[PDB]
Amino acid sequence: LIGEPGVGKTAIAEGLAQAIVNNEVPETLKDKRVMSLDMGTVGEFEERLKKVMEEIQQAGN
């Protein structure tokens, strides 16, 4: 999601998470959990990023 600051760059994904309960997206996007992770969280620093990527690589959910 690319856009000007304050134009709804973060609000675009906000409505997708709410629509997950109502199943407003297609079956491909259904049964999926979207996580908005801040960029300030992250060898030692990259361990958290690697663990998150590994657990979401072969899962796809």
Add this chain to the structure above:
Amino acid sequence: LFDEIEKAHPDVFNILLQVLDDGHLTDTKGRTVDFRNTIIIMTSNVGAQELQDQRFAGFGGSSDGQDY
């Protein structure tokens, strides 16, 4: 049995190396004990986290099929 060998003072490791090669020890009183009729087993907690990392490397897969 030497449990928690991964968490021990370094000086204790020096004694262990002597037992493995020399095969006997002498106490402060000068009497010599024997180790030719004993089996030494040490339990370490290291590497277990590495093994479970292989179990969680992929979602639904592991590395048990590899050669021992």
